[PDB]
Amino acid sequence: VQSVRRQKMFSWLDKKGSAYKEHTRQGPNLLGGQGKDGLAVPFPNNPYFKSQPVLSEGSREIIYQDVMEKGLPIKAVSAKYNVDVRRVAAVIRLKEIEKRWIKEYKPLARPYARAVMKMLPQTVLGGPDQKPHESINDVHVHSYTTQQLFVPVSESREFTREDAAKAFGDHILPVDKKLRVPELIEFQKDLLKEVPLQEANRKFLNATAASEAKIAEREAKRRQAVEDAITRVKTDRFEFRFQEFNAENVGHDGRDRNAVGWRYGVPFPDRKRSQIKIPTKVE
């Protein structure tokens, strides 16, 4: 005979918990329910963790087609739909793998995709943009900027963000330079100068499009400078790659983090606790 505890379980699992046996309505059906900010809560005891919306299927294509077909800079697409540049780049990478599967005549997980997307909140981009997908201007809290400092200054001083950055340290930058899309500040400054919105967007596009050109240039010069140091000498069996380097960069005592060579005067750390023996980087 079932115990009392199990009997109570199946009792709750039949009347109150029967709403989770199947997902009939579209949207989240979590236990915590809708919160004060209109976001479901998967755990009632933890109100801070909310189920955030995920990019709808049709929305993922809009982002992909804009960056590929129209060739717009990722920064512009990130600021248009309020999607992080790190997410926009992932949507394209994942979408390119779909083209490969569709090109290779591979069967997609369509039955699993449709059912799961009905359990999560979505944000359809385009016309019906109720709220921004996420915050694209989130700044990382630097450890230096977390200190409680009360600097004594003149009673009539104009303490700006630049001065505050110098108070935390000499090599620190203000939040105006730590943004992922700094072209927005320049765009907002145009709205203060009674500039037509039609022109304010034009300058923004040219700004982002110009920055991506620079970044693409540095990358090209970098990769080209890394291959100039590799002299490939093909052989009968393999290809020997001789990478050049400076044998004098070992520091003033031979201890340099970037030095090349198996360091001397150190035994094997294999018997140390918490020693990592797993690949830390899969290129």
Partner 1 sequence: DSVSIPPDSPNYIKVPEPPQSSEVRHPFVKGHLPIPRSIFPKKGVPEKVQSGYVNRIAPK
Partner 2 sequence: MKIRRLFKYHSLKKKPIRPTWNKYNLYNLATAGREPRISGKTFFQQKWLAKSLTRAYHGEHIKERKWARMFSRRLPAVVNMDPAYMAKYNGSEQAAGRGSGLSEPPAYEKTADEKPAKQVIANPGRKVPTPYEQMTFAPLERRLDIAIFRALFASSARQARQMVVHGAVTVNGKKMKHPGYLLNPGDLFQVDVERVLYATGAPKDKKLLAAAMKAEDNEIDPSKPYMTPWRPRNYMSAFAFIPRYLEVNQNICAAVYLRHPVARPGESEVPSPFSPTINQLAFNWYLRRG
Partner 3 sequence: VLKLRLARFGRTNAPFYNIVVAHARTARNSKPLEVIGTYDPVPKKDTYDTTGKLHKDIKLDVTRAKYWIGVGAQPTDTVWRLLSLVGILDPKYKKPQP
* Interacting residues with partner 1 (CB under 8 A): 74, 85-86, 89, 92-94, 96-97, 100, 140, 142-143, 172-173, 177-180, 215-216, 219, 247-248, 250, 252-257, 259, 261, 263-266, 269, 283
Based on the shown chain and the rule CB under 7 A, indicate whether residue 271 belongs to the binding site for RNA.
yes
- Rounded distance, CA 125 to CA 80, Å? 10
- Rounded distance, CA 277 to CA 268, Å? 12
Region of 96-104, 124-132, 143-151, 173-181 interacting with RNA (CB under 7 A)? 143-151
Burial of 229 (0-12, 13-18, 19+ CB in 10 A): exposed
Which residues within the stretch 213-232 sit at the binding site for partner 2 (CB under 8 A)?
Answer: none
Burial of 46 (0-12, 13-18, 19+ CB in 10 A): exposed
Closest CA to 107 of 95, 98, 94: 98
Based on the shown chain and the rule CB under 7 A, indicate whether residue 273 belongs to the binding site for RNA.
yes
Task: Closer to partner 3 by CB, 219 or 256: give it.
Answer: 256
Which residues within the stretch 196-235 sit at the binding site for partner 3 (CB under 8 A)?
Answer: 231, 233, 235
Closest CA to 42 of 119, 112, 152, 157: 119
- Rounded distance, CA 151 to CA 169, Å? 13
Question: Nearest 5°: phi and psi at 24?
Answer: -90, -55
Judged by CB under 8 A, the residue of 109, 192, 225, 247 near partner 3 is 247
Task: Closer to partner 2 by CB, 107 or 127: give it.
Answer: 107
* Structure-block tokens of residue 235: 């052989």
In the stretch 122-151, what mask flags binding to partner 2 with x, by CB under 8 A?
------------xx-xxxxx--------xx
Question: Nearest 5°: phi and psi at 66?
Answer: -65, -40
Q: Is 84 helix (H, G, I), strand (E, B) or coil?
A: coil
28 contact choice in RNA, partner 2, partner 3, none (CB below 5 to 8 Å, kind-dependent)? partner 2
Based on the shown chain and the rule CB under 7 A, indicate whether residue 280 belongs to the binding site for RNA.
no
Task: Closer to partner 2 by CB, 110 or 234: give it.
Answer: 110
Based on the shown chain and the rule CB under 8 A, indicate whether residue 120 belongs to the binding site for partner 2.
yes
Q: Return residues touching RNA (CB under 7 A).
A: 1-6, 10, 13-14, 143-144, 146-147, 168-169, 235-238, 270-275, 277-278
